[PDB]
Amino acid sequence: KNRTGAEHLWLTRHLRDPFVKAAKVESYRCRSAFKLLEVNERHQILRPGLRVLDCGAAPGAWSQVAVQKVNAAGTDPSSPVGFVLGVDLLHIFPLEGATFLCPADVTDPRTSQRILEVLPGRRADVILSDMAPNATGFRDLDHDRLISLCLTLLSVTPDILQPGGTFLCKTWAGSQSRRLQRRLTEEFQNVRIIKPEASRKESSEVYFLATQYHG
Amino acid sequence: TPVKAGRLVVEMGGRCEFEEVQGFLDQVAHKLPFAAKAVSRGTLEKMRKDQEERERNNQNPWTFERIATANMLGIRKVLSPYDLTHKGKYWGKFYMPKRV
RNA sequence: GCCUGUUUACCAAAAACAUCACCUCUAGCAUCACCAGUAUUAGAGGCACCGCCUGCCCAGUGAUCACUUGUUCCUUAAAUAGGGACCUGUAUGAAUGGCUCCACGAGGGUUCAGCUGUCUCUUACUUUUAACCAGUGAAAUUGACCUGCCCGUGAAGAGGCGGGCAUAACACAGCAAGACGAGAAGACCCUAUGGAGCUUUAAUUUAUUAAUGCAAACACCUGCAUUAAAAAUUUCGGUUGGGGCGACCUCGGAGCAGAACCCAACCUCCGAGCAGUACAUGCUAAGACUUCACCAGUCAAAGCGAACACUCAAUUGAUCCAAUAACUUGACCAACGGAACAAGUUACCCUAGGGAUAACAGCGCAAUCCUAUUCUAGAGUCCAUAUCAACAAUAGGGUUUACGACCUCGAUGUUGGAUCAGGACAUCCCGAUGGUGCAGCCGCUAUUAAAGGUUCGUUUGUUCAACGAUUAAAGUCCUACGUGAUCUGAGUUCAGACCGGAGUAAUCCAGGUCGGUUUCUAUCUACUUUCAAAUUCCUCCCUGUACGAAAGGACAAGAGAAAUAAGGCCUACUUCACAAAGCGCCUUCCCCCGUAAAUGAUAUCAUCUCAACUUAGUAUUAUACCCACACCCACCCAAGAACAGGGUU
RNA sequence: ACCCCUAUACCUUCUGCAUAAUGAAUUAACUAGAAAUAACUUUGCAAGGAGAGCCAAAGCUAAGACCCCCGAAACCAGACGAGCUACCUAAGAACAGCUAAAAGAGCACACCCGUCUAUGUAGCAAAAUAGUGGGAAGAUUUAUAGGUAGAGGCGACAAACCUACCGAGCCUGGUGAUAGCUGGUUGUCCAAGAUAGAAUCUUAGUUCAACUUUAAAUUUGCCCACAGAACCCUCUAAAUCCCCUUGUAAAUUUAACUGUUAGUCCAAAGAGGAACAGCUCUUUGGACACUAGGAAAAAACCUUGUAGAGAGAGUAAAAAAUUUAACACCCAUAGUAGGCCUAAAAGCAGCCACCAAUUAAGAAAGCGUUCAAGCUCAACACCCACUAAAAAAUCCCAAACAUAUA
Ligand SMILES: [Mg+2]
Ligand SMILES: [Mg+2]
Ligand SMILES: [Mg+2]
Ligand SMILES: [Mg+2]
Ligand SMILES: [Mg+2]
Ligand SMILES: [Mg+2]
Ligand SMILES: [Mg+2]
Ligand SMILES: [Mg+2]
Ligand SMILES: [Mg+2]
Ligand SMILES: [Mg+2]
Ligand SMILES: [Mg+2]
Ligand SMILES: [Mg+2]
Ligand SMILES: [Mg+2]
Ligand SMILES: [Mg+2]
Ligand SMILES: [Mg+2]
Ligand SMILES: [Mg+2]
Ligand SMILES: [Mg+2]
Ligand SMILES: [Mg+2]
Ligand SMILES: [Mg+2]
Ligand SMILES: [Mg+2]
Ligand SMILES: [Mg+2]
Ligand SMILES: [Mg+2]
Ligand SMILES: [Mg+2]
Ligand SMILES: [Mg+2]
Ligand SMILES: [Mg+2]
Ligand SMILES: [Mg+2]
Ligand SMILES: [Mg+2]
Ligand SMILES: [Mg+2]
Ligand SMILES: [Mg+2]
Ligand SMILES: [Mg+2]
Ligand SMILES: [Mg+2]
Ligand SMILES: [Mg+2]
Ligand SMILES: [Mg+2]
Ligand SMILES: [Mg+2]
Ligand SMILES: [Mg+2]
Ligand SMILES: [Mg+2]
Ligand SMILES: [Mg+2]
Ligand SMILES: [Mg+2]
Ligand SMILES: [Mg+2]
Ligand SMILES: [Mg+2]
Ligand SMILES: [Mg+2]
Ligand SMILES: [Mg+2]
Ligand SMILES: [Mg+2]
Ligand SMILES: [Mg+2]
Ligand SMILES: [Mg+2]
Ligand SMILES: [Mg+2]
Ligand SMILES: [Mg+2]
Ligand SMILES: [Mg+2]
Ligand SMILES: [Mg+2]
Ligand SMILES: [Mg+2]
Ligand SMILES: [Mg+2]
Ligand SMILES: [Mg+2]
Ligand SMILES: [Mg+2]
Ligand SMILES: [Mg+2]
């Protein structure tokens, strides 16, 4: 055993968490799926027939939500069939109605080319980003790293994202966040900062949602 | 499946001696839940004869059977009715071969 | 949550309430409220500024108008289906829902930069308190106490019981491990034919009010009846973790007392709540049986009268009361010994109790798990035993178990952290060995070893989980979460509030989120400088050696640097200044025992020997410190709470 | 005096247990069983008794002799309360300074409030202090007088406030409310005295039975021996019922009452979905709630019961045992690599036969080689001897001892 204070605090929080209980009930792989659900309840980012790119897809709960919403699985005959693509360096468990390209990193041009090839029409309607660098124990360093990753995603965005497209990305709060927001404001008409109730109150995590892409 | 003391669990025959089969049979006997041993016709008969001989040979004036049947110290108070038949050889599932 | 504002006086200031604006409902009116008012008004409510979207059950097609249809009548036995009239003076729909947004907030969360003893890691000084002297002088508490420790016993748990051990007696000052430490106030579960508040589609009412009708009276009043509103009185059976969905409560049969009777709770199964044939299924009467009481229930000789007291395991219901001329009849009173008729909810709760309370409540071994051994199948290139290991067995330590072969989720002084740790070894590191599928460095495995040590941070996802950076290693456990009269998160867990779900509601959730009061002056036990023996890492030498084909790369012995720990100190530095401190400086000493070998018998070889024996082997370590005693005026002190101690040549 | 030996405070409660829990600082005083019918006992009179009524098939009259204490939350009636607080009415008062086109504006006094922390917790205080805070021309704060009253008021709903304790104030009365619940229940001595059940809005209680006590009447009671008490299911035991004799002395009936009961543990047999342990439960018996001795302390195991005094004696039960693993020396040619399948299996991948030479060796029992090659074993001589486990947490736990006559 030999649990520390922080270890025990996290563990109690995890056990008492309703979202993990809900995930195990609703056969969701991870709790963070619920965050996307909430976002989709507010802005209706996902519609049937839409093309979805998912980055840092593992363990694939985001892909699960995506395929359910965009009717990628084709459960609803009336609803148009959509496309969901998931990219993560770690191996992802197979899911019906979804394709996973692994191992790949979005930043790499070669991997980007592969994604485009697999994607119908060589473009993606919506991009979802949930990846985060391994927490180093320092808020500043982790913040900078995640901002850098989001900036690289934003740089590679134009090639993959259709005009008027939607982009959701997870960021830790800090100094550089403002700068990123400005850059989003430069490229997207609508920029929103969303903290879902599924996201831990103690956590500094937040979501930048960018809508109506131009240029 | 229940097994009582004195029960033959498995049998074996053929063109072989006891010593040949005894090895693996004893192996199996050890791996059984209850106390068990490999026996031939000869060995079983010898065992029974030795028990009979011990009963006849005993120098102890007092036997469990005698005392139990006659209720000699009011002993039936601490004995089971089954003890009359068991003659003190059997105690629960366990069996004592060393008791006359 | 628009805002300013209001709220639980005395644990909640809020997201709750109110609030402009908007919306719904009700009302055509005077001399005591509304109001000396009148529909742009007034009252009862909902929602919460503004701003932007969201609006038809108005009868259908065809070319305001014809025509079936809708509604009403009549003909028709009555209908079907025919004859006539009307729908053409107007209609709007939401106390509906979403959406941004300016300002604001002791609201909840996140964050930039600085900042600071919050922390690394604490120190110095002042005041209060303190301790001593003088005066005054409480409280909770108290069976009596001449009030020890270890192990055991007492389902846990002992100052007092057993076996050991210890022990001149008395203050004063600290301490909080024990005295299930003290005072209330709790929280949890259960109980009472104990309360109360609230709700209703619980039962019983309509005395009250309002309206209506019928009498009376010639509109009001009175009597009667009906309808509503408003209340009023009273209750909320029993079993089943607890809760939801269910099941059950009476009678008969089997497991089921092996053989007189009785007796197996709970459970596992079955069945019964009739029916058929008589119509003397008439009357009466010895003696008996009996569901362990009573009430009920059962059998029956003889006799009178007839003829030549039915089958079936249960197949059932007291009293009262009602109907009836009598004879009789009447409850799915099934909660089946039966109240004539009464439900929910309480986190606003109350009282009287019981139980946990708190470390037992389930203590001499069935089921299951882990560990070790045994078994020798099977992996391991061949090769059980370098390493791993199937079905099993044995030993030790955990967990579970009496019936809804239903989905749950439980528990809750429950568990984190701080402080200080005591202990075990089943060793994570450091020591010493044996084996290896051990060339060396790393390893794998076992034996021995508890002296010492065993880090700092942070959570994007992870069902007792990680991530980052380290380390010689970041051990597994017991100690009533070890430790709350040393401190502190969260949970049980609640008084306020909202969301999702449930419920007609009150309210609930075994769901989520915000806010939220436990005080203690120490009487006793125990203890308050045991001390004098330190570990580890890294670097260098060996040496780049041995080893190895290279790649790579030791062990002993020695040297140097550190870190920590224990014990001191102030020359400098730093906090500061006759001094106290760390961030500074100084010192730090013995081994461990598992095996590896000689000689050599039982057993003339061999054999390390629970043979006599011989070495590694170290054995009892040892040494260090302390050690003379005026006056006990006074003064001083590097000594000190008091006391004591040192100095006064 | 102490030292020695022996000795687990008292009361009360829980089905049973105390050592658990309850109550007690101590002293003095005060503080808790009230009555009938019917029975019994003792008198009077007696088919009558009684000082009208009433009873009477020996009764009647009289007397004696049996029935506690404290405690709720509540409910209702009649008063008293708005000098606190909630709201309102009448007529008043207060609000520095600075910024502001000027305000339920901002900063900020006084004033009002009470966010957060610390102190305090029998306190300065039955809600305070210090700092920090929110508001501070207004839906503001505040003085005076008046009003609304409990089946109610009042409320920017907090079940808020209504004189420190409001889910319904306070006081008095009804009221000695009621309490199947908790606690208590006061001289001495002796005697008899314990666990089948049924019903119940019932399992914290009560009524009947069972057991227990007393008094009275009368004859059997208990222990028991032959004989006797079922088939079916294919099995089933210890036993039980009935019972002369005998050994014993009790039993039944009558009259009158109370009180007790989910008892606990041990031995045995079982029951709870075909759960060997545990839990729950039934039966038989024992012990315990009654003494003592013993087993380490010890309710339930063993020994033992009928009471006192003794500085006598004989006894009963009554002290655990156990220590465990050696083993052969010597030697081995050959028909042939026995045939089939197999790259080949040649003694040992598999199948069939299992003969045969020396004096004596299995067409080979175990290893080992891709197959071979090899190391054993059985074989001949030689004559040798060969007879089964352990661990834990404060500190091991009587001291010890193999050798004088049960
Ligand atoms: Mg966190
Ligand atoms: Mg507000
Ligand atoms: Mg204001
Ligand atoms: Mg405000
Ligand atoms: Mg207030
Ligand atoms: Mg308050
Ligand atoms: Mg407050
Ligand atoms: Mg509101
Ligand atoms: Mg606020
Ligand atoms: Mg003091
Ligand atoms: Mg004094
Ligand atoms: Mg006092
Ligand atoms: Mg003890
Ligand atoms: Mg003792
Ligand atoms: Mg003291
Ligand atoms: Mg005590
Ligand atoms: Mg009642
Ligand atoms: Mg009542
Ligand atoms: Mg009877
Ligand atoms: Mg019965
Ligand atoms: Mg007859
Ligand atoms: Mg009933
Ligand atoms: Mg009944
Ligand atoms: Mg009955
Ligand atoms: Mg509440
Ligand atoms: Mg108790
Ligand atoms: Mg208790
Ligand atoms: Mg193998
Ligand atoms: Mg438990
Ligand atoms: Mg320690
Ligand atoms: Mg060890
Ligand atoms: Mg623990
Ligand atoms: Mg404590
Ligand atoms: Mg607060
Ligand atoms: Mg001196
Ligand atoms: Mg007391
Ligand atoms: Mg007044
Ligand atoms: Mg007033
Ligand atoms: Mg006025
Ligand atoms: Mg002013
Ligand atoms: Mg203002
Ligand atoms: Mg202001
Ligand atoms: Mg107000
Ligand atoms: Mg409310
Ligand atoms: Mg409330
Ligand atoms: Mg009051
Ligand atoms: Mg009373
Ligand atoms: Mg007696
Ligand atoms: Mg009843
Ligand atoms: Mg009851
Ligand atoms: Mg009761
Ligand atoms: Mg007889
Ligand atoms: Mg019992
Ligand atoms: Mg040989």
Burial annotation A41-58 (CB, 10 A radius, 16+ → b, else e): eeeebbbeebbbbbbbbb
Reported as type and span, the H/E element at residue A37 is helix A33-43
Strands A99-101, B94-95: parallel, antiparallel or unpaired by DSSP? unpaired
CA A117, C1' C518: Å apart? 70
The nucleotide whose C1' lies nearest the CA of A130 is C460
Integer distance in angstroms from the first to the last C-alpha of chain B? 29
CA B91, C1' D133: Å apart? 84
What is the CA(B17)–ligand 6 centre distance, in A?
Answer: 97
- Say how far apart CA A52 and CA A119 lie, in whole Å: 9
φ/ψ of A188, rounded to 5, equals -125, 140
CA dihedral A120→A123→A129→A133, nearest 10 degrees, is 100
Query: What residues have CB less than 8 Å from A4, skipping those under 6 apart?
Result: none
- E strand intervals along chain A: 51-55, 83-87, 99-101, 124-129, 161-172, 188-194, 205-213
CA dihedral A55→A57→A58→A63, nearest 10 degrees, is 180
The nucleotide whose C1' lies nearest the CA of B93 is D276
- Say how far apart CA A169 and CA A53 lie, in whole Å: 12
Q: Which long-range contacts (CB under 8 A, 24 or more apart) does A101-109 make?
A: A106/A55, A106/A152, A106/A153, A106/A156, A107/A149, A107/A152, A107/A153, A107/A156
Q: What are the CA-CA distances from residue A66 to residues A30, A126, A164 (Å)?
A: 14, 10, 19
**Other beta carbons within 10 Å of A126:** 23
- Say how far apart CA B3 and CA B6 lie, in whole Å: 9
Active site positions of A, annotated: 170
φ/ψ of B24, rounded to 5, equals -75, -30
